Every structure is written in structure tokens, then in C-alpha cells.
């Protein structure tokens, strides 16, 4: 429970196909907690409980890049998965997936 | 031009200077008038939301 999230997770028991040589299954969840709020964990079993959480303040929204390219130090403003771009000219043909101005 | 006393090329100044000015304004307008903000065109979706 929290100020905006609330859900009761009833455990289920069944025989699942073997994945990574393990019979069981586990559904992972996440939620956000506002400043000055309260989160609650009440259960009698079948619950894995957080040890370390994370704190943040989100800055608008960016993208996620999947590639096989090494990383070095730069100051760039466009980021294709296969390199960077001058962005001094208004048209590029490197990759449709880009992040930045 | 060629005359009795000399010859050679002599480029005009003012007309091509104005030409350079207008062409640099032209390329500046073509390049810079397109303004672009931060964006993330890469989106990810799962199997149940094709």
C-alpha cells in the first residue's frame, strides 16, 4: 500500500515448465513513493522484500540505446547507436533511432 | 580586358560581394531556420502490445 498504489497479491501454486532448471515462478513489481509518503508491506509468505532501494529526481525523458559500441569521453548532442553527429546541419542519414537535439 | 598598354583579368568587387552576402544569408536561412528540441525517438514495447 501507499498513497496511490494498492494491490493484494494472492500467491498461486502450480507446476510450471522448467526455465533455468527451476520449477517455480516469480512476478516482480515496482512502484513510486512521493516525498512525505508511506509504503506498507504486510504478508504471511510468498513475498520477497526490498533490501536496497533507490532515490532519484527524474529529468524529463530520454531513450535507451542497444548497440555493441565502446564508450569514451565526448561532448555531443546527437547519439545514434552507431556514433554521434555534428548537428550543425539539419539532415542526417545515420540511423532513425537518435537521442538528443 | 586588353588594350594597347596592358591586359589581364580584373574581378568586379561590389556585385560579387553582395552575391556572397546574399548566398551566406541563404545558406544560414536554410540551415538554421530548422530548430529542434530534445527528444527520444527510441521506444520499447513488449509482446502483448504490438
Amino acid at each position, epitope marked *: 500500500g501507499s498513497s496511490r498504489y494498492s494491490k493484494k497479491f494472492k500467491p498461486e501454486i502450480a507446476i510450471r515448465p522448467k526455465v533455468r532448471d527451476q520449477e517455480g515462478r516469480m512476478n516482480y513489481y515496482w512502484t513510486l513513493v512521493e516525498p512525505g509518503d508511506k509504503i506498507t508491506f504486510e504478508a504471511t509468505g510468498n513475498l520477497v522484500v526490498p533490501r536496497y532501494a533507490f532515490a532519484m529526481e527524474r529529468n524529463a525523458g530520454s531513450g535507451i540505446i542497444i548497440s555493441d559500441t565502446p564508450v569514451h569521453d565526448c561532448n555531443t548532442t546527437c547519439q545514434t547507436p552507431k556514433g554521434a553527429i*555534428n548537428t550543425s546541419l539539419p539532415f542526417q542519414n545515420i540511423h532513425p533511432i537518435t537521442i538528443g537535439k | 580586358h586588353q588594350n594597347e598598354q596592358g591586359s589581364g583579368y580584373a*574581378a568586379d*568587387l561590389k556585385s560579387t560581394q553582395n552575391a556572397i552576402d546574399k*548566398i*551566406t544569408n541563404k*545558406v544560414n536561412s536554410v*540551415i538554421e531556420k530548422m530548430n529542434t528540441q530534445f527528444t527520444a525517438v527510441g521506444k520499447e514495447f513488449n509482446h502483448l502490445e504490438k
Partner: antibody
Amino acid sequence: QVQLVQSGGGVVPPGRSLRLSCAASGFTFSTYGMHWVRQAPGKGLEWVAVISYDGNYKYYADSVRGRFTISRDNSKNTLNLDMNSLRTEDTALYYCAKDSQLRSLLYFDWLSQGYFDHWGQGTLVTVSS
Amino acid sequence: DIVMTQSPDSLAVSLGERATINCRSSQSVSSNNKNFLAWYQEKPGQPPKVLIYWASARESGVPDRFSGSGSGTDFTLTISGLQAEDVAVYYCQQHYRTPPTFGQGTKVEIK
């Protein structure tokens, strides 16, 4: 914020190369031309060299033509000045400047440059034995 | 190329009055109703900063007391109410030909 810092100067006897680098940051470097300008001690300023935004076309003054080599690396936002064939008169205080006309095109040897927006802090070069 | 001369050189006035320096170019610099001249000012130990660009405008951060005008081959820089922190050297600079040429320079200082 526009910033222009340069270094690498010092004392040099005539006849050996000297190289200067004017790193730039805080502004769009690759879309502007740059200049070289010097201050002879006890005299006034005078122009040295100019390089355009794409780096294809370069120009020099009538005093250092055929001896200097202005160069640029937009990948590092670094302006460079190869500097050879020295003489005693060449002692001065070197500044790197930025032109005002955005993305100016220089195609011939008489065109109209922009005015100098911002200047480097200045480094000393002198010619002595 | 083009050479210019600032006739008052090392002129000295005290605080509050008017300081006028002219600038006569060898040939015409202005084109299509636009002034291709800039002024520069340097203090001891500082790089020469821009003071007035296009001979009529003003660089942001320059005090309003600095004003200039002129047309054709003659241009003037005028100081309204000189301050003691403005002792410096002034320059002309025509950016019309590929060799931009600076003037010989003038000095302003206390009387």
C-alpha cells in the same frame, strides 16, 4: 559562456617551429570562423590569419604569408597555429578571436569578415637567442 | 589594403566631460546602408574587448555612456561622462577586406 584560452608560447631562437593551441568551449565552435591576431610590443594590433567554418579555405596577411599554417580540429574544438621561419620582428602577444558572421563563407581573397566577438587571454611569444 | 588614422592620439580629459576621437579611412568602407566598422578597448593586462560593433550598436554589458556614429569614411567615438575606470586604448577596425586593419590607436586618461 564563450571562453578562449591558449598556451604553448614562450621564448624561441629563430629557425625552429613553435605550435600554439587555442581551445574553445561554451559556444557552438564548428559553425563560426576563427582568427589570429597579434600585439607587437609598443605597437598596435595587426591581423594574422583566418580559417572558415569547414576548414577548407584559409587566408593569411601580407607579412606572414608562406610561413604560417593555420589549422583547426572541430572534433576537439581546438584551434591550432603552426608557426615556422621566425625572425626578430615576429615577437608579439597572440590572441585567438571569433568572427561575428555566423557560418560565413570565404571563397576569395578580399571578402568582408565579421567583427571579432570574443578574444583569448593572450600568450607571449618572443624571438631571442 | 586599407589604412586609417585616429587624429587625436593620447588625449587627456578629466571625469565627466566629452571625449571625441575620429577615424578616417583610406577608402569607403560602408556598403548598402550598413557601417562595417568596430571599436575595441583594452585595459592594461586585459585582452581588447569589443566596445561598439557596426559603429552604432553596443555590446551588451557596455555602459550606455559609450556611443559612436559616422558614415562613409569618417566615424567618431564619443564618451559621455568619462570615468576613472575607463583609462584604456581605443582602436578602429574595418572588416571590409580580407586584411582587417586596426588603427594606430589612441589613449584616454586623466587630465
